[PDB]
Symmetry: T
Subunit: 62 residues, 12 copies
Amino acid sequence: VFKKVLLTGTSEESFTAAADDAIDRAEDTLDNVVWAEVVDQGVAIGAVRTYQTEVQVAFELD
Amino acid sequence: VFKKVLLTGTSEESFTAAADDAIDRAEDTLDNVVWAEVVDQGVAIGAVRTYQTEVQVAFELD
Amino acid sequence: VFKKVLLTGTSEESFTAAADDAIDRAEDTLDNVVWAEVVDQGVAIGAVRTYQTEVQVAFELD
Amino acid sequence: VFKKVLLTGTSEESFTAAADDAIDRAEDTLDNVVWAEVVDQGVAIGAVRTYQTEVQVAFELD
Amino acid sequence: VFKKVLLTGTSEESFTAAADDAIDRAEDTLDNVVWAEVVDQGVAIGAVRTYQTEVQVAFELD
Amino acid sequence: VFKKVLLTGTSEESFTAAADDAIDRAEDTLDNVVWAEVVDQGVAIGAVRTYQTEVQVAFELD
Amino acid sequence: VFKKVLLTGTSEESFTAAADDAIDRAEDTLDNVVWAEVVDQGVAIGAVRTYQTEVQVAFELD
Amino acid sequence: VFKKVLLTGTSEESFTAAADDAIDRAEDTLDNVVWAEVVDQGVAIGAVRTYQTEVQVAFELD
Amino acid sequence: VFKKVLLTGTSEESFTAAADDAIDRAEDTLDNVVWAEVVDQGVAIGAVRTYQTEVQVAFELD
Amino acid sequence: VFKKVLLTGTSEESFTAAADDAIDRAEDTLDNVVWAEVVDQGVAIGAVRTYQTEVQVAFELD
Amino acid sequence: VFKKVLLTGTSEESFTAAADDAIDRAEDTLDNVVWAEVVDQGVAIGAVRTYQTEVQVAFELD
Amino acid sequence: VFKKVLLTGTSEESFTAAADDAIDRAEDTLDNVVWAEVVDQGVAIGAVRTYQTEVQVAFELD
Ligand SMILES: Cc1cc2nc3c(=O)[nH]c(=O)nc-3n(CCNC(=O)OC[C@H]3O[C@@H](n4cnc5c(=O)[nH]c(N)nc54)C[C@@H]3O)c2cc1C
Ligand SMILES: Cc1cc2nc3c(=O)[nH]c(=O)nc-3n(CCNC(=O)OC[C@H]3O[C@@H](n4cnc5c(=O)[nH]c(N)nc54)C[C@@H]3O)c2cc1C
Ligand SMILES: Cc1cc2nc3c(=O)[nH]c(=O)nc-3n(CCNC(=O)OC[C@H]3O[C@@H](n4cnc5c(=O)[nH]c(N)nc54)C[C@@H]3O)c2cc1C
Ligand SMILES: Cc1cc2nc3c(=O)[nH]c(=O)nc-3n(CCNC(=O)OC[C@H]3O[C@@H](n4cnc5c(=O)[nH]c(N)nc54)C[C@@H]3O)c2cc1C
Ligand SMILES: Cc1cc2nc3c(=O)[nH]c(=O)nc-3n(CCNC(=O)OC[C@H]3O[C@@H](n4cnc5c(=O)[nH]c(N)nc54)C[C@@H]3O)c2cc1C
Ligand SMILES: Cc1cc2nc3c(=O)[nH]c(=O)nc-3n(CCNC(=O)OC[C@H]3O[C@@H](n4cnc5c(=O)[nH]c(N)nc54)C[C@@H]3O)c2cc1C
Ligand SMILES: Cc1cc2nc3c(=O)[nH]c(=O)nc-3n(CCNC(=O)OC[C@H]3O[C@@H](n4cnc5c(=O)[nH]c(N)nc54)C[C@@H]3O)c2cc1C
Ligand SMILES: Cc1cc2nc3c(=O)[nH]c(=O)nc-3n(CCNC(=O)OC[C@H]3O[C@@H](n4cnc5c(=O)[nH]c(N)nc54)C[C@@H]3O)c2cc1C
Ligand SMILES: Cc1cc2nc3c(=O)[nH]c(=O)nc-3n(CCNC(=O)OC[C@H]3O[C@@H](n4cnc5c(=O)[nH]c(N)nc54)C[C@@H]3O)c2cc1C
Ligand SMILES: Cc1cc2nc3c(=O)[nH]c(=O)nc-3n(CCNC(=O)OC[C@H]3O[C@@H](n4cnc5c(=O)[nH]c(N)nc54)C[C@@H]3O)c2cc1C
Ligand SMILES: Cc1cc2nc3c(=O)[nH]c(=O)nc-3n(CCNC(=O)OC[C@H]3O[C@@H](n4cnc5c(=O)[nH]c(N)nc54)C[C@@H]3O)c2cc1C
Ligand SMILES: Cc1cc2nc3c(=O)[nH]c(=O)nc-3n(CCNC(=O)OC[C@H]3O[C@@H](n4cnc5c(=O)[nH]c(N)nc54)C[C@@H]3O)c2cc1C
Ligand SMILES: [Cl-]
Ligand SMILES: [Cl-]
Ligand SMILES: [Cl-]
Ligand SMILES: [Cl-]
Ligand SMILES: [Mg+2]
Ligand SMILES: [Mg+2]
Ligand SMILES: [Mg+2]
Ligand SMILES: [Mg+2]
Ligand SMILES: [Mg+2]
Ligand SMILES: [Mg+2]
Ligand SMILES: [Mg+2]
Ligand SMILES: [Mg+2]
Ligand SMILES: [Mg+2]
Ligand SMILES: [Mg+2]
Ligand SMILES: [Mg+2]
Ligand SMILES: [Mg+2]
Ligand SMILES: [Mg+2]
Ligand SMILES: [Mg+2]
Ligand SMILES: [Mg+2]
Ligand SMILES: [Mg+2]
Ligand SMILES: [Mg+2]
Ligand SMILES: [Mg+2]
Ligand SMILES: [Mg+2]
Ligand SMILES: [Mg+2]
Ligand SMILES: [Mg+2]
Ligand SMILES: [Mg+2]
Ligand SMILES: [Mg+2]
Ligand SMILES: [Mg+2]
Ligand code: NA
Ligand code: NA
Ligand code: NA
Ligand code: NA
């Protein structure tokens, strides 16, 4: 059985790096992280632009 | 990084109050709740009508 | 077996009241109405504003 | 011909009031506003909760 | 309040059995599991075919 | 001209059998039933699991 | 309150004529038909091509 | 950079002519109109039927 | 077994004629073409307008 | 690089068997078939019922 | 109240840079640009490849 | 007439590079490749992360 958590990563560099940011966090807390599916992307436009990528991160249970 | 949980709130009053019910629960257990996105709405039609609003509730990790 | 009818309720007060308007009509004509799922919402903007909520209203057959 | 603008209204009271907030703004600047279609709803969760409703607001050209 | 977890069950037999696999896991760890909504289905095609069914599994909080 | 009715069939066995349950009901009351399109699937999780499959069932008018 | 029926019209001429075919049928049986929304279009490719347009046809109840 | 405006054209003749009606209006007011994407179609059913086609009309900025 | 190819037909006349253009091409190269489903429509706006209709064209294998 | 073909399998038994029918055909003609994603399901309702499952079948190129 | 404009940015480098191109244009003409949501991505494949990213760019009114 | 093939490109660097990988393959085998539309993005999370971008790649027939 796989479980997915819905995480939004952030980066001041790119959408790819923002996806990586979410995956990094998943891997810090979860075992057996296997894949991620991009579900949304955006940009927070402030003093700087922060790229965001929302991902379902799938991990194998047990 | 943000994480979202998928909660369905309920109210005998309104769709807004049902969204609030879910957010109330999120805030009881989670720190740094920042926003909610409505993803579904409905009504359980019994002795009384119960309005339901399903929300992704986003919170900041750490 | 459940059957759904696609009804648009109207209210000069709120989206919740507009959903109720549709459900009210369903319950006037149908037996065993059990739930409603919101599928669209809008506002007719005239002399007054009329809130509309479109619902699939599910009822149990037999 | 109709044209639509994509507006997000806000209210500390309800999703209906947030839709109204967007429509109010449309009517301040545009002639012949005829209808609005809800396209998203959410809640900014801060010191207070701010309900938001995003609407396509349609107006007749000329 | 209901909460949903997003689980992908697997079976070498059928899409129904794969949905059951996810629900089985939910019921092992969670109290008050009430329903599941199918959100995706697929097949891993290897030495054998493994049917997968992704479900939102809803449970009542408290 | 074809008309569709939106029916949710149920089965304690499978998603296919649940689709059949809806079609069975359609054929009991309607003439010239020609096809069904699956639009949703789920499982009611109680004393037993009840698989549900929602179908648009198309029939030829006249 | 409005109600919608889901009809597929057919024409050997055009998608517009196929929409009209569905509306024609609605108006033959129903009072207060007010609008139709196109939800699908296709073509049956046989001895001749038959254009099909599926519409939700809305009518005012009472 | 391209910008899109969301216009609903109308015609008593056809969905194609309704798309053209929107594009005609775009070209009256905007420079460098390049393409249109159909996003919705419907029919206002009154004394006469009025076909409507909603289009995103894209134009090149500058 | 059916297979679908994703084709975009073009016409300077209408969306229906553009669908036909795609189907014409399918029938030139493929045996047992049975149906087409419209998946997108648009207009290339140049010296002339070119209507486009994208279709999944289904054909029976073998 | 992966490529997907869009196939509709058929079975007089089940949606799972219909998915298998499509995959069987893919594997007869293609090398390195790796997965399938269900994209639609339905039932042809004639002398017998024929379950259909449409799948994107992914295979590795080279 | 927020308003969104639908812009397609372009870059010969990346999807992120294409999103930035749209945002750059928004900020040249509009005050109080706050966020952007990615709604489509593609690539024009000519003498060179031009990455495109379509964004809803939100700005605060007044 | 345009035809689209559904390809998933891969890269250990970025989503843009993964889109390019698919387009590269298309251009190796097909004439008159004109555009690509991104339809999905994800990441295979193993010894290394492999970014994937699924694209419809459109080419002109003849
Ligand atoms: C993908 C995406 C979707 C969103 N959706 C919403 C929304 O639906 N409603 C909303 O209020 N804010 C959103 N936001 C806004 C979160 N805020 C944000 O991005 O702010 C960027 C900068 O602008 C400043 N800022 C925040 N709120 C406001 C504001 O209301 N007005 C102005 N002028 N500036 C503002 C603070 C930051 O330096 C979204 C941000 C992203 C990246
Ligand atoms: C948004 C939404 C989606 C749903 N979707 C489903 C579904 O897909 N399948 C399903 O079985 N029940 C659903 N439900 C039903 C959950 N039950 C429910 O709302 O019941 C309302 C009242 O009706 C009674 N009830 C429950 N099940 C039945 C039933 O089967 N028949 C009758 N006559 N009444 C029933 C108990 C409550 O007093 C949904 C409820 C809501 C609010
Ligand atoms: C959710 C939603 C979707 C819609 N979609 C369409 C549409 O696609 N095409 C369309 O013609 N009208 C629509 N309508 C319009 C139905 N008419 C409507 O709301 O009118 C409100 C007031 O404006 C007046 N009105 C109606 N049509 C016209 C018009 O064409 N121009 C002007 N200036 N006003 C008009 C009569 C009412 O007092 C929609 C209304 C709602 C609430
Ligand atoms: C519908 C909707 C979609 C959104 N989507 C995004 C998004 O995609 N990315 C994003 O960064 N912020 C969003 N936002 C956030 C806009 N900010 C926001 O709602 O903040 C509410 C309160 O929380 C505070 N806040 C803002 N950003 C943060 C934050 O990052 N962490 C914490 N702890 N608090 C924060 C300021 C306000 O008092 C969305 C808000 C709404 C209402
Ligand atoms: C619903 C669904 C969506 C997917 N989506 C992706 C995807 O987007 N990207 C991806 O790389 N793999 C996917 N997969 C692939 C997961 N792998 C998988 O199913 O492998 C089946 C058998 O094929 C073998 N395999 C795995 N990767 C490859 C591969 O790259 N090439 C070949 N020839 N075989 C492979 C191992 C297994 O025995 C998906 C599997 C399923 C069931
Ligand atoms: C596809 C699908 C969508 C749904 N969506 C909703 C919904 O949106 N809101 C809702 O209240 N119930 C739903 N339901 C719930 C209908 N009820 C249901 O499935 O109950 C299964 C068993 O659990 C018991 N049950 C019902 N409601 C409750 C509950 O609230 N808590 C607990 N612990 N158990 C409950 C009675 C049955 O023996 C859905 C059921 C299905 C199959
Ligand atoms: C929009 C749309 C969606 C569809 N979806 C399906 C589907 O999902 N499954 C399916 O079996 N048939 C479909 N059909 C097929 C309905 N049949 C049909 O269009 O047939 C056209 C001509 O081809 C002949 N035909 C029917 N079935 C067959 C077949 O299986 N093979 C061949 N070679 N020809 C056939 C009879 C007619 O003269 C669809 C038709 C349309 C117009
Ligand atoms: C695509 C589309 C979506 C829509 N969606 C809505 C909606 O969501 N809510 C709504 O109130 N009206 C709509 N409309 C209605 C706009 N009105 C409309 O089409 O009216 C046609 C004729 O019927 C008459 N009409 C208008 N409103 C009524 C009405 O309420 N009842 C009756 N019997 N007739 C009416 C005036 C015109 O001669 C839509 C029209 C179109 C073409
Ligand atoms: C449904 C649809 C979706 C599209 N999507 C895109 C897109 O996402 N990105 C893009 O660059 N072009 C598109 N196109 C543009 C393809 N080009 C096109 O339609 O051009 C029409 C006339 O305008 C001229 N043209 C082409 N590119 C340009 C341009 O960039 N600027 C100007 N002023 N004119 C142009 C040549 C033709 O005579 C789309 C065309 C259609 C019909
Ligand atoms: C998922 C799905 C989507 C479809 N969509 C369409 C459609 O959009 N338009 C259409 O014409 N037929 C469809 N079809 C119809 C393909 N035909 C079909 O299923 O026929 C079943 C039995 O009924 C008989 N049949 C075929 N067409 C007719 C018909 O028009 N009327 C009657 N009474 N029976 C008919 C022959 C078979 O024994 C679809 C079939 C399936 C399984
Ligand atoms: C996301 C996206 C969606 C689109 N959708 C459409 C469409 O729906 N219909 C369409 O005609 N063109 C599109 N386009 C095409 C816009 N044209 C384009 O990208 O052209 C790229 C290069 O190919 C050349 N080119 C343009 N049109 C044609 C063509 O018809 N054939 C050939 N062989 N080459 C062509 C000129 C450029 O150097 C789309 C481009 C993008 C980036
Ligand atoms: C976008 C996308 C969608 C997918 N969807 C599915 C799916 O629906 N079902 C599925 O089984 N695998 C998928 N996959 C999985 C394909 N496998 C994959 O990415 O594996 C990455 C690394 O993890 C290892 N791995 C593969 N399967 C398993 C596994 O089951 N458990 C563990 N712990 N590790 C695994 C091999 C690779 O080094 C998807 C991969 C991508 C990139
Ligand atoms: Cl989720
Ligand atoms: Cl828009
Ligand atoms: Cl319906
Ligand atoms: Cl496809
Ligand atoms: Mg930096
Ligand atoms: Mg988002
Ligand atoms: Mg009360
Ligand atoms: Mg729901
Ligand atoms: Mg009042
Ligand atoms: Mg509507
Ligand atoms: Mg207050
Ligand atoms: Mg939003
Ligand atoms: Mg076995
Ligand atoms: Mg999936
Ligand atoms: Mg049993
Ligand atoms: Mg459902
Ligand atoms: Mg003729
Ligand atoms: Mg259809
Ligand atoms: Mg005329
Ligand atoms: Mg519309
Ligand atoms: Mg001509
Ligand atoms: Mg397109
Ligand atoms: Mg049998
Ligand atoms: Mg289908
Ligand atoms: Mg360069
Ligand atoms: Mg696009
Ligand atoms: Mg590297
Ligand atoms: Mg995918
Ligand atoms: Na989730
Ligand atoms: Na219906
Ligand atoms: Na817009
Ligand atoms: Na395809």
